[PDB]
Scaffold this motif. Sequence first.
Motif, mmCIF file in Angstrom:
data_model
loop_
_atom_site.group_PDB
_atom_site.id
_atom_site.type_symbol
_atom_site.label_atom_id
_atom_site.label_comp_id
_atom_site.label_asym_id
_atom_site.label_seq_id
_atom_site.Cartn_x
_atom_site.Cartn_y
_atom_site.Cartn_z
ATOM 1 N N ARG C 4 0.822 -1.207 0.000
ATOM 2 C CA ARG C 4 0.000 0.000 0.000
ATOM 3 C C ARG C 4 0.857 1.259 0.000
ATOM 4 N NH1 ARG C 4 -1.659 3.714 3.804
ATOM 5 N NH2 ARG C 4 -3.729 4.632 3.458
ATOM 6 N N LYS C 5 1.924 1.273 0.802
ATOM 7 C CA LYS C 5 2.746 2.473 0.918
ATOM 8 C C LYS C 5 3.513 2.764 -0.365
ATOM 9 C CE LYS C 5 2.586 4.365 4.042
ATOM 10 N NZ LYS C 5 3.552 4.335 5.175
ATOM 11 N N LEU C 8 0.973 4.285 -2.736
ATOM 12 C CA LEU C 8 0.265 5.460 -2.236
ATOM 13 C C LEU C 8 0.907 6.748 -2.731
ATOM 14 C CD1 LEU C 8 -1.988 6.609 -0.501
ATOM 15 C CD2 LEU C 8 -0.474 6.428 1.485
ATOM 16 N N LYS C 9 2.241 6.804 -2.732
ATOM 17 C CA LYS C 9 2.928 7.992 -3.228
ATOM 18 C C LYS C 9 2.741 8.148 -4.732
ATOM 19 C CE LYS C 9 4.716 10.082 -0.762
ATOM 20 N NZ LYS C 9 6.178 10.059 -0.480
ATOM 21 N N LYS C 12 -0.717 9.886 -5.500
ATOM 22 C CA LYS C 12 -0.720 11.330 -5.296
ATOM 23 C C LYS C 12 0.310 12.053 -6.153
ATOM 24 C CE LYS C 12 -0.180 11.215 -0.956
ATOM 25 N NZ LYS C 12 -0.503 9.763 -0.981
ATOM 26 N N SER C 14 0.301 12.285 -9.461
ATOM 27 C CA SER C 14 -0.439 13.001 -10.493
ATOM 28 C C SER C 14 -1.617 13.781 -9.924
ATOM 29 C CB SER C 14 -0.933 12.021 -11.560
ATOM 30 O OG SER C 14 -1.779 11.034 -10.996
ATOM 31 N N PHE C 15 -2.342 13.199 -8.973
ATOM 32 C CA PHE C 15 -3.481 13.862 -8.359
ATOM 33 C C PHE C 15 -3.015 14.738 -7.198
ATOM 34 C CE2 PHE C 15 -6.204 10.040 -9.801
ATOM 35 C CZ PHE C 15 -6.289 10.580 -11.069
ATOM 36 N N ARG C 16 -3.961 15.427 -6.576
ATOM 37 C CA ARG C 16 -3.640 16.250 -5.418
ATOM 38 C C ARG C 16 -3.440 15.365 -4.194
ATOM 39 N NH1 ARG C 16 -8.035 19.107 -7.873
ATOM 40 N NH2 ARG C 16 -9.421 18.110 -6.348
ATOM 41 N N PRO C 17 -2.312 15.487 -3.489
ATOM 42 C CA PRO C 17 -2.134 14.702 -2.257
ATOM 43 C C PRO C 17 -3.203 14.974 -1.215
ATOM 44 C CG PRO C 17 -0.044 15.619 -2.995
ATOM 45 C CD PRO C 17 -1.109 16.263 -3.834
ATOM 46 N N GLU C 18 -3.744 16.195 -1.176
ATOM 47 C CA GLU C 18 -4.828 16.500 -0.248
ATOM 48 C C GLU C 18 -6.074 15.679 -0.552
ATOM 49 O OE1 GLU C 18 -5.294 20.677 -0.831
ATOM 50 O OE2 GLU C 18 -6.503 20.459 -2.647
ATOM 51 N N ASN C 21 -6.004 12.412 1.242
ATOM 52 C CA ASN C 21 -6.155 12.532 2.688
ATOM 53 C C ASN C 21 -7.604 12.326 3.111
ATOM 54 O OD1 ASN C 21 -3.488 13.248 2.343
ATOM 55 N ND2 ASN C 21 -3.583 15.047 3.682
ATOM 56 N N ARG C 22 -8.548 12.866 2.337
ATOM 57 C CA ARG C 22 -9.958 12.727 2.682
ATOM 58 C C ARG C 22 -10.437 11.288 2.537
ATOM 59 N NH1 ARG C 22 -12.939 17.192 3.245
ATOM 60 N NH2 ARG C 22 -10.802 17.912 3.646
ATOM 61 N N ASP C 25 -9.748 4.688 3.252
ATOM 62 C CA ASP C 25 -8.894 3.547 2.953
ATOM 63 C C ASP C 25 -8.656 3.450 1.455
ATOM 64 O OD1 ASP C 25 -8.842 2.877 5.657
ATOM 65 O OD2 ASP C 25 -10.533 1.492 5.477
ATOM 66 N N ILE C 26 -7.534 2.832 1.093
ATOM 67 C CA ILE C 26 -7.148 2.616 -0.296
ATOM 68 C C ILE C 26 -7.136 1.117 -0.556
ATOM 69 C CG2 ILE C 26 -5.433 3.067 -2.077
ATOM 70 C CD1 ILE C 26 -6.789 5.552 -0.955
#
Lengths: 50, 619, 68
Positions: C4-5, C8-9, C12, C14-18, C21-22, C25-26
């Motif tokens: 997952r880790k 996960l980076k 984010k 290409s997309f907004r890391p914020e 956050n909302r 779970d992934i």
Amino acid sequence: VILFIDLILKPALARGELQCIGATTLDEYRKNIEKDAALERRFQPVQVDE
Amino acid sequence: NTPTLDSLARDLTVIAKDGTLDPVIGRDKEITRVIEVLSRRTKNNPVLIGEPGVGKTAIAEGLAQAIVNNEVPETLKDKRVMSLDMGTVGEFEERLKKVMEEIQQAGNVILFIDLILKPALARGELQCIGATTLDEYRKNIEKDAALERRFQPVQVDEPSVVDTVAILKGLRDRYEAHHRINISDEAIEAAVKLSNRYVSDRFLPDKAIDLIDEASSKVRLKSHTTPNNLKEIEQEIEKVKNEKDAAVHAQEFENAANLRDKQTKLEKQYEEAKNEWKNAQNGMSTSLSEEDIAEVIAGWTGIPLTKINETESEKLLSLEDTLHERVIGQKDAVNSISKAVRRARAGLKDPKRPIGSFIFLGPTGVGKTELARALAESMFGDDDAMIRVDMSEFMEKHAVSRLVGAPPGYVQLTEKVRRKPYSVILFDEIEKAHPDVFNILLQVLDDGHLTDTKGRTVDFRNTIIIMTSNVGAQELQDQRFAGFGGSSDGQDYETIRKTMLKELKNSFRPEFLNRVDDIIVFHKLTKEELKEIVTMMVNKLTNRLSEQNINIIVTDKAKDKIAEEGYDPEYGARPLIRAIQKTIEDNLSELILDGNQIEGKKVTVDHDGKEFKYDIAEQ
Amino acid sequence: ETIRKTMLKELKNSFRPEFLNRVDDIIVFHKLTKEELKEIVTMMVNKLTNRLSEQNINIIVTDKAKDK
């Protein structure tokens, strides 16, 4: 007599003589009432929900 | 008497002479502006430029008021202000042909539009006052050479808060005599302050006159109710009348005398109680305090009454204590920003510059995001009132016109900040943004306001600007492993600030960092720091389970066991979040799902070395 | 969680890391293997029998045919 309507009659409320309780939808209230300054300071919207 | 114009427009001097409407108060600085332009030989057609809602309509109303009050000069004396209504409207131009002829022939009618007629302006025989918005003024009026040399731009801006106070004092007589509520002087300045602080979608002064109407009526209606003295006897009057009807139609007049006497007797006592109740009400005064003002605004935005009632006096003094509730460790960063923010709010620096101007440097996921959220909750009381804009999508040059406003001809940050002036602006990965973006960012730190493509000027004086840059984190994490058996946490904060300052300006402009008050650098998370974070999560669940009334207590042995499992200094508190969910929440949910096995009791979790033992006991 | 880790980076990047956050779970999907498809074949056999409820026809397929 308390007037009740479900939006000519614009001068009837300008003088503050009649007391009309409208029942028009929100779409029509922003169509021919909000854009008119004469009717803007005459009708007080009341938010009624479920 | 211009009969044609009287049927296709509304006259203002008729309303002003009658006095049936509230006169304009506080717009004395704009009436002289209108007459000044009208007296000019050229460009004598002033235009009310501004966003709809500032009160441009009252400008025309005030002008007609001067005629009745004999305040207009001799040149404009004996003139009637006429406003054309666009709601009534080839065949369209047929009506206006006769209307415009009468205006020139009369010589005393002042045209007022809200925008055939362009050639009329070139003649100078008509004095029309336009009311087009600023966006359309530079699009359709400026592009025409004839209209540019005939219309004089006039700016109508929002009046000051102190100026609005005098506006409310003028209408004090009309409000007190109507609601029968003695309006206090202190409530006038408090209501306008609260209305502007929370509501920003209507500007001034329309949000200051309607706020007192509902607050005064709230106590007026409350004080106009029966205090359990007249309702009890009122029902007794009605019931006895029903008994009497059975004493006549049933041909039983023996009880008629008793019911008649009792009915009359109850009328005397009911009237006496009602008469004596209103005598005390008239003597007492139901004044409107500032408490009722905050009640009305409490339900409009959802802010609790307790937060609004705060006087903002001791909140800044104990800022360090408040921020430590949600942030654990790195106390140096808490005190560094607490002393910096209190100087700007008092007024020790330039008010136009942003209150908060700091740069965040440190490892990702160490708690920097948590600290940023603390500012919004501790200052404004709203956690979601924090506009966060990331620079991941602003790497290219084509994104420059995104956060500032779309160019005219097509279909962000500037628009959002206007609706929430009291918000915290957070920037992520500022080191990976296009260089042209920094030009707009620098203007915020120095000037304090920005203008979009439509010409509307938003304000940034109530925003906190924080740019979190991940650069320099490699040096910070190298110091932790530089020495075996110790770390750089014992080093003084000033030493770390100076060492990391050189790397900060290496990739950034030198003069840009001069506008930053203080540089804030985060620290690392050790074993003991993560243990307290676990305590915060456990207590958060207990508070959240207040409805279910569950007492959750975790032994210190279990706290250490779960801390080491998710112990990862590279990330920080992120691995611990997964560990808590997969250990505490997995079993807590099952107990609730099993017909609410735990309810109003005490649950303790203890680690015996191999597994976790759950004990169920009464509270 | 280990995989997952790593991704996960990337998500984010290409997309907004914020935006991530909302998200609570992934979820990352795996890849089907040889023996996992064998049980899927068994699932489809029961579906056909459920289809022929009015006909009441019983459908049985050997695992030899399922794997073949």
